[PDB]
């Protein structure tokens, strides 16, 4: 009868949330509810540098194979017309 008298009056609940949450020596809302900014770090945008340096390796290697192409050196209307038949059916 006292137990019902305690829980109706919120006495148990004020005993509980003090002793679990308030006496807890950190917070879910002490540390998570803060708002701070950051400047972008290089780890945040390191991918755009990877494509760029990766692009310049691809920009040179295409240039070098075309260099041996045009130094060590397609127009026929029939056989790519067959390639038009192959691809469009594909």
């Amino acid at each position: 009868l006292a137990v019902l008298k305690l829980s109706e009056q919120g006495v148990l609940d004020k005993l509980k949330n003090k002793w679990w949450y308030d006496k807890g020596e950190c917070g879910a809302k002490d540390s998570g509810s803060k708002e701070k900014t950051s400047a972008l770090s290089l780890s945040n945008v390191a991918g755009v540098f990877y494509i760029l340096v990766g692009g310049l390796g691809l920009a040179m290697l295409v240039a070098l194979i075309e260099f041996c192409y045009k130094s060590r050196a397609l127009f026929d209307r029939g056989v790519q017309m067959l390639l038009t038949t192959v691809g469009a059916f594909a």
Binding site: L42, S43, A46, F49, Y50, V53, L56, G57, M60
Partner: peptide, 17 residues
Amino acid sequence: FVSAGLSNIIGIIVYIS
């Protein structure tokens, strides 16, 4: 020498990242 530059810059990046 140009490929020496491309290798040198990415190694700076993976150092910092």
